[model samples]
Each structure stands twice: as structure tokens, then as C-alpha cells.
Target chain A: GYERLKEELAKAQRELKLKDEECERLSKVRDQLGQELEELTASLFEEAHKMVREANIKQATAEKQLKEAQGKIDVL
Target chain B: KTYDYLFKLLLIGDSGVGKTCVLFRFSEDAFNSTFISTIGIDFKIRTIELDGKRIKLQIWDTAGQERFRTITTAYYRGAMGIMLVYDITNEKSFDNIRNWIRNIEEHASADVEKMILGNKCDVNDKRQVSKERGEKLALDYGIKFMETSAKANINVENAFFTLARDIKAKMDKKL
Candidate 1:
């Protein structure tokens, strides 16, 4: 029975090592995924962000400029 | 920041196991002592910071009553993580954990991570199912196990965090 117990313990130890390896590998992969998501998100928003920024500047300046010209026409 | 990953979590267990309360405690940070039965399916969404990523969890609280068992099959396959809940004070609910897992097998993804939660652990005096029994059953299936008191808010957060952590790990492994 003692011999059996030792063998069982050894088997369990081997199993634990596999578990540990799997855990470490997964941890690395998870970091990879998180970082990748960050990159993808940046890429995704970058397109929309640039357009929004350009549009915002145009709206603030262009809209006011058009309003002033329209006001000048009304004065005529 | 926006969510990096959207995870779908399914709650499967017997009725009166306080599945709704478990969701409320985690999502709303509030506990409802009054029992309210889930109809077909109700869900809650909460975002958490995990592994430096904001992950949003859409948790589906399923109707655990016998009449609505059919509702479960339709939603199981979409889940990334499954939480099997049972009432600690109700031996029958605890026994039905195996049956629920069978249901999981019939519908959920083969690689889905599952966690067994023994709810209502606050009522220690009325406990009909021992923690040891829950642990043994969890071991038999290689599932993660935890005893949670939804009302007292014991192990509720830990269980969700554990499952989310596992879900993230599994997804990363696939990549």
C-alpha cells in the first residue's frame, strides 16, 4: 500500500507539472490577447477618431465662418 | 476604456438556489431577500478589470424551475463559461448538479469552462449539503468549486472572478 501511495503521489506530481505548464502557457497567451485587443481597439478607433477630429475642427470654424457670411448677405 | 472581450456566462442550477441573488450581488452589488423566479431568461451586464483588460460579462440568469427546462438548451451553446449553482440547504438541488452538467454537455461548447457554486451558505444551521460533498463532486468532474452566500456576499465575487479568469485563460490558449 505504501508503494502504491508513492506511485500515486508521483503520478499526481507529474499531473501537477502539466497543469503548471498549461497555466504558464495560458498566462502568456492571455497577455498576448489583451495586448492584441488593445492594438486592435486603437486601430479601430483611430479611423473614426481622426474623422471626428477633422469634422469637429471644421464644424467649429467652418460653421461660424458660413454663419458670418450669411449674416453679411442678410445685411445687404 | 472599451471592453477588450465580451464573455457570455450562463447560470444553471435548480430553482430556489438563489441564482438571481448571486447575479444581483455581483452585478448590482445588492441582494434581494425576496425570492423572484426568473421567467424564460434574464441577464445582467457588468464590466470588470482583468489581466489589464476591461472584460464585459453578460450573465444570463436562466429559469431553473422544471417547466422552463426547455429554455436552457437554446442558450447553452452561446456561453463561454457556465456557473452551476445549487442550494446548500437543499439536498435535492445539490444532487441535481450532475443532471445540469449533462444538460451543459447536450448544448454548451465542449471547451466551455464551468464552476460549481453552492449558494445560500449563509444559512449554516439549515445546511443539508456539506461543503465536503460539494468539493468531492467538483473533483469528480474536474470543475472548480466554491460555496457562496449570496445574501451575506460570501465567495460570490470570488466565484465570478475565478470563472472569468479561467475563461480568459482558455481563450488565450486558443490564440
Candidate 2:
């Protein structure tokens, strides 16, 4: 929408203005919010990272849990 | 932890910054802000049984868009805490939080406390604000910077509890 700003200026400005205020207000979340920051950064990774990594991040965690359970069952 | 703790928490942030998602993820146990833009100021109530007392948490979700700013005045009544949010991927969104605070200071009640949020915690690659930036912002505002991921569910609980804790403290101090 920003790329087409010429057409969306008025509307975008309103939205942007709202965004501007929101950002200004919420910018100071917490000093040690790094861990949550990592998660947010990772979310942006979905587009660039391996399609597999994105797919795996959500899928692998569950499967890994299952595999661990399977290995434990075998040991038992 | 005496009895009957009631507080109103307001969420303000840039559109698409995932304010709705974060709140939804915490309250409804789901994160999908893409669908709802939030008509105006929408609120929900939940009573949690804690320490032999019931804690009532009221969460008001607002569209961080300018069109919805008019609703802020209406939502400010009986508020204990506020959660202001920004999109880490958008530099403008981060800058907007300042204005949001100004609005609150101007329009909202003076007693309403606030917390800052760097929302969309799941989006890491295209980060516009660094951890140092967030920390500095938090310091400058004298408020807590809670980075949150609505999708990843990172610190989702803490983000919600932090406000509750503050509101409770406010009440305790008042008492």
C-alpha cells in the first residue's frame, strides 16, 4: 500500500498517523524484552528462511516431541 | 490478593502491528488479528480464581489505526492499565507510541498507568528496532518494554500478567 502512496495518501496518512501514535506509545515495552524480541524476529524469518525451516519450526517441534515419546517407549 | 480485583486494560498500537492478535492469543488462546480490525473499542471480561480470590481482568482491544482514535476517549473510563504496542518491522510504528502516550496523557484519566509493547514478536528477520533501541525506549518512557509474539506465544502470558500485576499493585498501594 505504501508503494502506491500517491493514491492511498489520504487514507494511508490517517492509518499512518494512527500507526505513528501507536508506535510512539508502545515503543517502550520492557528493557529486557529480548527473548520476546527473538520470537518476533523469528516470525519475520518465515519468508526468508528455508520453506522447510518455516514448515519445520511449526511441524518439527511437534514431531520431535512424538519421536522422543517413541524412543522412551522403546526403552521402556 | 484480598478479594474482587477489577481492572481495565487498554491495547493501543499501529494497525497490523498485531495488537489484536496478542490480546486474542492471551485471552482466547488464539492469535489471528488478520480477520478483525476491531470496530472501535472492544472489551472482554474474564474472572480468574487465584489465591482464594477472584481476579477480574478487562481487556479492551482497539484498532491502532487513526480512524479508531475517536474511540479512545470512550474507552478510557474506569481503566487501571494500558498496553501500548508497536510493530518491530515498521520504524514508523515504533515512533507512533510516543504520540499514543501523549494522547493518553491528554485525553485519558491521569491515574491510568501504561506499558509499552513491541508486538509481532514472531517477526525477527526484518526487525527495525534492535533490543538496545527497545531498552532505550523503555528507559525513556519509564515504563516496561514487553516484547510479545502473538503467534509464537512468546511471553504472551507475561504480557497479560504484567499489566494485571501492575493494576493489582496500584490497588494495593491505594489501599
Candidate 3:
């Protein structure tokens, strides 16, 4: 009975070790994913700023064209 | 369909030299007396007919902060012309024009057309840099020079037109 109890204790210790290893692996993956998320967010913000600037310039160009057209129409 | 030639020009100088105001005056034909620092870079388009060709000028205004130097310098690569600007009332800005020119020489194309503009000339009473001084600087570099006042709409159109015409002439010669 004593030998059987010792065998059970060793089995439990092995199981705990496996669980700890799994937890460590998952934590590593989580950290990598978090870092990726941060980088993606930064890139997205930069892209958005570029798009907005381009849009503003395009709008200004359109406004100038409209004004010129109005001036030509007034002369007619 | 709107233009025969497309020219990318840049306005670069020390901060508070009226680069944005100059761009607004030429592109929008408008002005605001308020002073606001420019961000990374912003551009406006103006189509002018020069020598019977519709030349589209994409004028880019850059922030004059040292922090933005890297980004603005990157823009110098594709520019066909550059305007080194300084305020007539600011001697420091005028003195810094040489450094700006050096920056252009390092980053911009070898054949990039350059012009020097002393802005805020309408504020004659508070002038710190003389017209002859600006002219001498331009002469030293063998480029064109003009004194402009975006606030009073003085020489604003002529400055842009002159640069665009010069760019067009160079393009014609190349073709």
C-alpha cells in the first residue's frame, strides 16, 4: 500500500509539471500577440494620418477648380 | 487632362517664416493673419498656364521643426524645385537660409531649381534683413530671388509663376 501511494504521488507531480509547461508556452504566445497588436495599431494610425492629409489636399484642389469655373461663368 | 506638366515643388525654411501663408496665398488666393505651426508636411495644387502649357504645381509646405527634419528631408528626393524662404523681419531665419540650402544640396536632386524668397516684406518698418542682402544670397547661389508679402498679396503670384515658368523651361529643354 505504501509503494502504491508513492507511485500516485509521483504521478501527481508529473502532471503539475506538464501543466506549468503549458501555462508558460501560452504566456509566451500571448506576449507575442500583444506586441503584434501594438505594432499594427501604430501602423494603422500612421496610414490614417496619411490618408487624411491626401484627402485635404484633394479637397483644396477641387475647391480651387470650382472657384475658377465660377469666375469663368460670371464672365459669360 | 488638366495639365501638360506636373512639377513638385517644396517650401522649406526656419519656423514662422510664413511658408504656409505663402502656400495659401498662391493656391487659395486667400490669407489669414493668424500664425499656426505646420505639421509633418502639407501640399496644395495650382494649375498655371505657362508658355501655352498647363503646368500643374504641387507645392509642399514642410514643418520647420528639427524633429520633423527626417520626414521633410525624405520629401526632398522627388522635388523638382525648392523655395528657400526666410522672413524679412527675422534675422535668424535669414541666417538659417544657408543651412536650409545646404540641406537641399544634400537631399534634393542635383539639378533641382531653387529660389530664395524673403517674405513679410510688407512689414517694412520691422525689417531686419534688407532686399539687397537677400539678392546677394541668391546671387551667390546663382538662383532667383524675390521679396514677398502673403499678408498684403505683394509678389505672391509673381513668385509662384516665376518658379513654375522656370521649371517649365527646364522641362522643355529636357524634352
Candidate 4:
């Protein structure tokens, strides 16, 4: 019965190792997604800002869109 | 410098002469006849194309007090052009046009393009100063002159266009 207990403890250690590895893998995935999301969002707003400054006569639509994009960036 | 060209313009006049209205008309194509006093300097921007160049115009609308004038002197030094506005219905404003010019000459760039605008020309019935007086003062100072009606939207485009064109010509001369 003691031998059986030793086997059960060893099996629990293997399962803990696998769970930790899985969590580490998902954490990198979460970080990578976050980085890409921020980069893409910033690029989108910057383009909108550029659209406004380049217009010959500033358009209300462009300005409105730029403001909306800025709100998104600010919350981020 | 960020745009193809950046122009700095000054709108200086006594209080209630429609400086803000004129600016709103030019930049926003909107007008409010209601009077609101500008406590200090306010500015607006509009971009236009001249000779295939993207010209960004930065117009500074200032308050009408000597106290503010002292603070606005720093604003004066950078202006590529200055608009001296006066209320056509107010004789005192027209008479003091000289003082505004003197202020510009003393502070603005030597080559700055100056223009005299007699605003509220829409109220032709209430006009106190003759158009001839406006022209005479401008001629005396070797400046350009125009009459604008910000409320009724007359010659608003011409006033700004002429200034931008003159500024472009002067800048081109240096190149």
C-alpha cells in the first residue's frame, strides 16, 4: 500500500508539470495577441489623423472619424 | 513645416468687430451673429492648395484689449500676414485703424502682408464709415483692402484667398 502511494504521488507530479507548461504556452499567446492588437489599433488611428491633415478643405467626416478613433486609442 | 507650407495669420481688432465671426466664416463656413467676447487669443486651422502645394493656414483670433495686446505681441512676431478688421458701423473703430497698423508695423515682420477688412458690410443701412475711408486708410499704409459681411457671407472667401495668394507670392520670391 505504501508503494502504491509513492506511485500516485509520482503521477500527480507529472500532471502538474504538463499543466504548468500549458499555462506558459497560453501566456505567450495572450501577450503576442495583445501586442499585435495595440500595434494595429495605433496604426489605424495614425492613418485617420493623417487623412485629416492632408485634406485640402478639412471634412467634417474626417474630423469626426479621427475623433472617434482617438477615443478608442485613449481608452487603450 | 509639417505641411507643404504653414502660414501664420493674425486677426486683431477692437472688441465686437466680428473678428471671431470672420474667422468662423472662413474656416468653418459657419456663422453666428451672436456676440461673444474672446477672452484671449484663439486660433483655427484650414488647409488649402496653392500651386500644387498643400498650404496649412493657422489664423490667430485675438482679444481687443491693450492688456491682451501686450501678451499678443509674441503672436505678432510670427505672422506671415495680418488682418486689421474694423466694424463698418462703428466710426471710432475706423478712425483708430491707424493705431492697429502702427501696432502691426512695430511688431510684425517687415515683409508681412497686411490687409484692412471693414466687416459687417451686410448692414449697409447702418454703416457709419464710408467705404472710401476704408480704402483711403489702406492706401495710406500701402495695404490691401476689402469689405466683408461675415453674417451674410459676402467676400469672405476673397478676403482669405487674397491674403494667402499674397503670402505665396512673397514666399516664392525668396525661392
Candidate 5:
């Protein structure tokens, strides 16, 4: 889930993916956006969190679940 | 929660069982669509008056942490009813209910009456705890077993009321 904030955000996402890992600026942008990805992931996980909650899922694994959705969002 | 009976239904399980959701469905017809885990201690209460007196239910839910024995031990005080839950889609969870039952047997006070809950019961496509097995466990415990889905409202109210009936029966018998 991405915001249509900028057509800039969308372009930024596409550029982040295609840019080679070896380039300096590409790496910098990747890293910055990477943090944003973490944030996004955290939120997505939050949704999953809510689903489990609605399911009344009483989970025991805190370590595996910590920043869970946030981690997955990083790839986006 | 408040009740004239004052049944403290403590939920016991390994983890990943839908204890909280089932409770919500039974009590308030509420369900969550997210996936957050309950922390160290989480619970909800509601008062149901029985026989012209108030029946207060103190639902105590605990995290399935490995090392929280001390906190969990403390949480066991004064329980009069139990909601022994297991995941119908998880074999390990089903197996773990044995240990959970054992723990409750050792810890919960004698005044406590219990009910065995096979949660995620609507997930028949991926059910792990067979009706045969759940029945056997509940029989062995000398109680009743039933499958329920908190979201689908399948046997949701019955689970709670059935247990409430059993608790009264057990306590009244003793008296």
C-alpha cells in the first residue's frame, strides 16, 4: 500500500528498485527510502496485528513478531 | 467483568490460540481484524447477573512467554472458572493443551470449574484438533468440549453459558 502523495513517491519507489546497489547516490536513496520502507512495514504489520487481534490470537512469540510488518514493508 | 457468580475464567494455552477473540465474540460480539499479540497481562470483564444476583467474570489472559512463570504464577490467584483453549489448526497447540490442562490442574484453586474450548473451529479446512480428540480430552477432564469461532459467532455464546452452567453445577454440588 503506497500513498499517491507524489507521483514522486511512486517514481521514487520504482527508481529505488531499478537502481544498482553499487552506485553511491543510488545506495543513499535506497537507504533513506529503506527506512521509510521499515516504517511502512511497521504499519502493515500493524494491520496484521489487528487481524490477529480480531481473531483473538494470543501469540507468544514476541521476538519473531517485533517490527514484523515493518520488516516486510522494507522490500516495497 | 461483573457477574453475580463472580467466575474468574482464566484462559490457558500455549500460544497462537484465539482466546481473546473468542472471549470478545462471546461477551461483546466484537472481533478484531488485525494481528497484534497480547502482552504480559491482558483481560476484559463483564457482569452478567444470575439468579437475581450479579455474576461477575474476571477474564485474566496471559502472554505465552517462556520465562514469565513468576508473573503467571501470580496471575493464577482466585480463579473460579477456566477457558482452556487450543488452536484447532495447530497440532502443537493441541498437544500443548495437555500441558496447559496439567498446569491448571496444579495451579487453579479447587473452586475453579473448567471448560475446554477448541478455538478456530470455523477453520474446518485446516482443523488440527479432531472432534474425537477434543471430546476425549474434555471427558478425561470430566468437563465438556465444544468447538467455536469468535468471528463467525459459531457456538460463541454457548461456550460461555455452558461453562457458566457447569461452574454453578460443580459449586452447588460441592455446597
Candidate 6:
């Protein structure tokens, strides 16, 4: 009866160790996923800034053309 | 370095009151008989010597149409002086002067200098508002008044000079 009890105790300890290793593996995977998400967010912000810059340049050029046209119209 | 004092002036009135012509004649010393409606807002710069002080005036011209009211009113805050103009040939424009003055009172600073201009005075035959009427209105409002002709270049320079002189004097007192 004492041997049987010792065997059961050893089996419980082994199961606990396996559960701890599984948790560590899942945590590592979660950290890697979080890093990837942060990099994607940064990339998205850079693209949005580039778009805004291009829109501003186009708007400026249109304004210049409109001004030139107005100048011509004033003389007529 | 170019000017001792810089004054921002504004021209406002009802559409077709010749606000642009008055500005063109003063800034360029030239005028075009053809009518061209102002878009939103535009400005001209002129440097004048008043009492030996070089005064640079940046005069902003605003569109008088009702659609541009919001856009034009936004500029009233920064103006040191404002010219309320009306075409003598148009009685409705003359009547609308009161509304423009109200706008100035609401938007401009309490100490902003003001002047009334009765433009297109050269066309006396087509005049709908009398000079005496204009003068009395200016007097009642406690603002200086002048009748001008942008085509004949009448009193255009004097109008600008008078406003600038007043603004300069007010600035000097502060110093």
C-alpha cells in the first residue's frame, strides 16, 4: 500500500511539470505575436503619412493654377 | 526693414459696390472697366510715407456675395482698419452698409479704425444716394467718409492715406 501511494504521488508530479512547460510555450508564442502586431501598426502609420504628404502637394498645385487663372480673368 | 509700421486693412461691402476696383486703383494705380467678381479673398501690399514714417499697408479684399460671408468675416478679426464701401449708383448697396457695419462690430476688435467710402461717385447722373446723405451717415456713425471714383481715380489715394494715418496715430499713442 505504501509503494502504491508513492507511485501515484510521482505520477501527479510529472503531470504538473508537463502543464508548466505547456504554459511557458504558449506565453512565448503570445509575445512573438504581440511584437508582430506592433511592427504592422508602425508600417501602417508610415503609409498614412506618405499619403497625406502627397495629397497636400496636389492641393497646393491646384491652388496655384486657380490663382493664375484668376489673375488672367481679372484683366479681361 | 522695409517699413516702420505694418497695418492690415480690410475692404468690405455688398457685391458690385466696386470694392475690387477701389483696391485695384489704389494698389496698382490702374483700373479695368470690366467687372470681375472676387472669388473668396485676396490682398495687395503698398508702402507709403506718412509723417516720415514708412507705413506698409496690407489691404485685404473680400468677396461681397452672401455665400462668402463666413469666409470674409473670419478675416475681420485681424484687421487694424476697415473700409465700408458702397456704390453711389446703387441704393441697395448703400442701404446694406448698416449690415456690414454690424458685422464689423461683432467680429472686429473694439478699437479698430473705420471709414465709409461712397464709391463710383464719378457717375453723378446714375447716383442713387446723395453725397449729403453719405456724409450724414458717416457723421452719425462717428466714422470718416469719402466719395471716390475708381475709374476717375478720385480720392482713392486719399482714402487709403487717411485710414493709414489714423491707424498709425493710434499705434503711436500705444507706444
Top candidate by DockQ: 5
Chain A TM-score values, per prediction: 0.75, 0.30, 0.55, 0.60, 0.33, 0.55
True contacts kept of 4: 0.00
The regions of model 6 sitting more than 4 angstroms off are A1-76, B29-38, B64-71
Error of 4 at B81 (Å): 0.3
Q: Candidate 5: which stretches are off by over 4 Å? A: A1-76, B1-3, B29-38, B66-68, B173-175
Tell me the tens digit of each residue's lDDT in model 1 across B1-175: 6988988788888877988889888986332422235344556678999979999887777775556544444457567899999999999898889998898887667888999999999899999999998999999999999999988989988899999999999888889
Error of 2 at B109 (Å): 1.6
The weakest ten consecutive residues by lDDT in model 3 chain A span A35-44
TM-score of each: 0.65, 0.63, 0.67, 0.65, 0.62, 0.66
Ranked candidates (lDDT, high to low): 6, 3, 1, 4, 5, 2
Q: Flag clash pairs in model 4.
A: none
* Residue B104 accuracy (lDDT) in model 4: 86
Cα miss at B152, model 6 (Å)? Answer: 0.4
Query: Candidate 1, B140: how far from true, in Å?
Result: 0.4
Interface RMSD of 5: 13.4
What is the alpha-carbon lDDT of model 1 when measured against the actual structure? Answer: 0.79
Query: What overall lDDT goes with each candidate model?
Result: 0.79, 0.69, 0.82, 0.78, 0.69, 0.83
Alpha carbon lDDT at B76, candidate 5: 65
Tens digits of per-residue lDDT for model 1, A1-76: 9999999999999999988999989756755564454335334434543456566777778888999898999999
Clashing pairs in 1: none
Chain A TM-score for candidate 4 is 0.60
The residue-by-residue lDDT of candidate 5 on B19-86, one tens digit each, is 87777665684445322262344567777655666767777776555434444554565677778888
Best of the two (1, 3) by TM-score: 3
Model 6 pairs whose backbones collide? none
> Chain B alone, TM-score of each model?
0.91, 0.86, 0.91, 0.91, 0.84, 0.91
Error of 3 at A39 (Å): 11
Cα displacement (angstroms), candidate 3, residue B132, comes to 1.1
Question: Candidate 3: which stretches are off by over 4 Å?
Answer: A1-76, B29-38, B66-70
Model 2, B1-175: lDDT tens digits are: 6447766677876777877777777766322323244454444555665446678776766674557544444554435688889888888889888988887787667778888888776788988888689878889978888888888888877877777777777777877
Worst 10 residues of 5 chain A by lDDT: A55-64
Q: Judge candidate 5 against the unseen true structure and give its global Cα lDDT, from 0 to 1.
A: 0.69
Clashes of each: 0, 31, 0, 0, 31, 0
